[PDB]
């Protein structure tokens, strides 16, 4: 026997059949929540109120979980478990909650913040109701990897994807507290150890590195320029990556070695490279933080010594003025040029290098695409190259349709990447040796045997596991000296790529998708839950999707449009293409 209980926020309403034994406890907490529950407006446009019944169930689950304690058994634990089971059988029937949340975004007028709050409340209630994600989740994608139809590879983004990486970290801390908090405070305490452990880290970190203080209170967060500095940013990027890996593994019910074993291969972009190899070494939850420790350690030192090798200087206000008032980025030591050939940019940098002294010369850091490269060097010498580039490139609204194609003036875009150190340059070479001492002193090693899946270099695209020397030294060499030929690293024939890295919308995932669009490879952003209107790549939700929505393949042009043969009953052969199929005559016409 269960008595009906109504809970409503204006128009939106839900009925929960609470067992009459525990109905008095339920008639109390609803009375409490209906007090806590704000006054509903028109359309639920105002924040902190549900728009759908699902949101209000979420808010109830979150509220009940806030009171319930895990250590001490209360009277509220029966209510929490009953409403959680009821919710699991009334909203997300079949598929995982992530696909439901996106469902609320596309279908209802739900805002992204409300979605994040609903997911946070659901997981908070699930962990508080002592019901973890122990069962091996039935995600279509990883099941098809089980049958081997899909080859899955995880990439790891570097710097210059977004600006506020810490804002994403905060978002992760709030929304997935129950899943991440443990790793976050482990990392925080690890860096607290490292700053005093290093001789003069406390000199580098002028406002310290109390990340947990900045996470809990946004007011305590220092200025953004402090956060973008490599010493602080680089390890925190690492954290965000690992945290994302942790979250997905916990939802999938995979151990970090199990999820690693599911990957055919993995690669990173600059710093990201260390995370993949740290992931290539991890086995189990207990043997997880030993891998993380090494990973978070190196990106700390990559931060510190590189900062000492080429510390950013104060730039003249006249240059910043010029750059801003000529619609260019803020002068930073990496500059991204799109729609321009490698031979063109190398010719331009050579031309600039002809005048400059060797110490102030620039060199090509990242070869992302064929026509999307990033150069690194002094932010003044980059501005000097920008100056030469702006002379050539035509104005952004100039119609050159009426000029013959050859005579046309090439029209490209050159924007200053949000970074504070010239990566993959001659400037960060000295630091290499210091970091190699920082590698050996702290007993930071990577073994050929310990790496399970092949991890690919950022320069030659070869597996690191076949190397003769220390993989640690090679990684250092790759991140601060060797350039990233990102197109040369990705010759692997994988069907699906996860962007664990930071950026989300502007991350390495999208760049790779563009680079090798139309080869049948499907890129999924694993760092952001969003809906792509084009649907030309997936988002986080497609990872946890278990239905026909979970296995989506991008079109490989060659195989989809393959020109075939056919013959009629009378044996007249036709070339069978889309057009010929339409018309029932060969795919040749005489035009008008």
């Amino acid at each position: 026997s269960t008595r009906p209980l109504t809970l409503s926020h204006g128009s939106l309403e839900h009925v929960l059949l609470v067992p009459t034994a525990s109905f008095f406890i339920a008639s109390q907490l609803q009375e409490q929540f209906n007090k806590i529950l704000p006054e509903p407006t028109e359309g639920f446009a105002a924040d902190d109120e549900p728009t759908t019944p699902a949101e209000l169930v979420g808010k109830f689950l979150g509220y009940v979980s806030s009171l319930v304690e895990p250590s001490k058994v209360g009277q509220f634990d029966q209510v929490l478990n009953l409403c959680l089971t009821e919710f699991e059988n009334c909203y997300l029937e079949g598929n995982d909650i992530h696909a439901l949340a996106a469902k609320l975004l596309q279908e209802n007028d739900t805002t992204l913040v409300k979605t994040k709050e609903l997911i946070k409340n659901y997981i908070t209630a699930r962990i508080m109701a002592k019901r973890p994600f122990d069962k091996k989740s039935n995600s279509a994608l990883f099941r098809a990897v089980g049958e081997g139809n899909a080859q899955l590879v995880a990439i790891f983004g570097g710097q210059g994807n977004t600006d506020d990486y810490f804002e994403e970290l905060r978002d992760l801390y709030q929304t997935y507290h129950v899943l991440v908090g443990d790793l976050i405070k482990f990392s925080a305490e690890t860096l607290s150890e490292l700053i005093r452990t290093t001789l003069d880290a406390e000199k580098v970190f002028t406002q310290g590195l109390n990340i947990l203080e900045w996470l809990e209170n946004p007011s305590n967060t220092p200025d953004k320029d402090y956060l973008l500095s490599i010493p602080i940013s680089c390890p925190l990027i690492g954290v965000i990556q690992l945290a994302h890996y942790v979250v997905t593994a916990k939802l999938l019910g995979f151990t970090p070695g199990e999820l690693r074993s599911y990957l055919k291969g993995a690669t990173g972009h600059s710093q990201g490279l260390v995370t993949a190899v740290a992931i290539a070494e991890t086995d189990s939850w207990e043997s997880f933080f030993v891998s993380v420790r090494k990973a978070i350690t190196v990106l700390f030192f990559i931060g510190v010594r590189c900062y000492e090798a080429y510390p950013n200087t104060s730039l003249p206000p006249s240059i910043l003025e010029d750059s801003l008032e000529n619609n260019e980025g803020v002068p930073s030591p990496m500059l991204s040029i799109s729609n321009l050939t490698q031979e063109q940019v190398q010719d331009y940098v050579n031309k600039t290098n002809s005048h400059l002294p060797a110490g102030k010369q620039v060199e090509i850091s990242l070869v992302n695409g064929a026509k999307n490269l990033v150069v690194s060097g002094p932010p003044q010498s980059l501005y000097g190259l920008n100056l030469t580039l702006r002379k050539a490139k035509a104005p952004s609204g100039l119609d050159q349709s009426r000029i013959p194609f050859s005579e046309r003036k090439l029209k490209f875009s050159n924007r200053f990447l949000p970074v504070a150190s010239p990566f993959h340059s001659h400037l960060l070479v000295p630091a290499s040796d210091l970091i190699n001492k920082d590698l050996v002193k702290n007993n930071v090693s990577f073994n050929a045997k310990d790496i399970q899946i092949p991890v690919y270099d950022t320069f030659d695209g070869s597996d690191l596991r076949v190397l003769s020397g220390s993989i640690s030294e090679r990684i250092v060499d790759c991140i601060i000296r060797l350039p990233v030929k990102w197109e040369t690293t990705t010759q692997f024939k994988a069907t699906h790529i996860l962007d664990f890295g930071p950026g989300g919308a502007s991350g390495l995932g999208v760049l790779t998708h563009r680079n090798k669009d139309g080869t049948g490879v499907r890129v999924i952003v694993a760092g952001t839950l969003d809906i792509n209107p084009d649907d030309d790549y997936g988002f986080k939700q497609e990872i946890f999707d278990v239905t026909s929505n979970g296995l989506k393949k991008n079109p490989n042009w060659l195989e989809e449009y393959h020109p075939k043969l056919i013959k009629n009953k009378s044996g007249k052969i036709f070339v069978e293409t889309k057009f010929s199929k339409l018309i029932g005559r060969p795919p040749l016409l005489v035009p008008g």
């Binding site: 043969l565 009953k569 009378s570 889309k578 010929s580 018309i583 029932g584 005489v590």
Partner: protein, 189 residues
């Protein structure tokens, strides 16, 4: 201009030479110079670029979806029935009248469709039976005469002397003209 040299060559000769050059190259690259590997179909064409039972029984209601209806009736195999129930335009002489088979078989409540010999086109017969004065009697018999004719007996029962009278619809089914293979027979019509 690089390929315009031969004067007064027939279009047939030129464009056959283009299609045949394409066939041979495709055959050599993907079919190992073997004609048998090329799949055969009844008539090639009529498939839109937007994208096994011997005897089945289908029942049209007021709810039935006309796409799924004609797909089911026509079936999967490329045969006379396929063209009959999926070709949008027949050819009355050189003129393109909308397909009258789709008009007669339009999915409305009451009609019941029976396919006999569905797997074997040579003997396939689709019979549509409608409630004639309450009793559900056979009304349409679409089948084959000699192989290259589509015969649709359109029978009326409410006659002068009870014995119903059959209407002979004939159509030449030319699968070589795959676009509109169905051409209604005007002679003696």
């Amino acid at each position: 201009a690089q390929f315009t040299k031969v004067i007064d060559e027939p279009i047939k000769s030129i464009m056959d030479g283009i299609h045949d050059g394409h066939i041979k190259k495709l055959l050599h690259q993907y079919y190992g110079d073997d004609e048998s590997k090329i799949p055969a179909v009844e008539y090639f064409g009529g498939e839109s670029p937007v994208d096994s039972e011997d005897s089945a029984v289908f029942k049209a209601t007021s709810s039935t979806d006309e796409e799924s209806w004609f797909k089911a009736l026509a079936g999967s195999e490329i045969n006379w029935r396929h063209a009959s129930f999926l070709c949008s335009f027949i050819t009355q002489d050189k003129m393109f009248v909308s397909n009258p088979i789709r008009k007669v078989f339009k999915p409305s409540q009451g009609m019941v469709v029976e396919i006999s010999n569905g797997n074997t086109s040579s003997k396939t017969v689709v019979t549509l039976s409608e409630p004639v004065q309450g009793e559900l009697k056979p009304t349409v018999i679409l089948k084959l005469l000699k192989e290259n004719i589509i015969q649709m007996e359109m029978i009326e029962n409410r006659t002068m002397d009870g014995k119903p009278v059959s209407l002979p619809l004939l159509y030449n089914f030319n699968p070589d003209n795959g676009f509109a293979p169905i051409s209604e027979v005007m002679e003696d019509r």
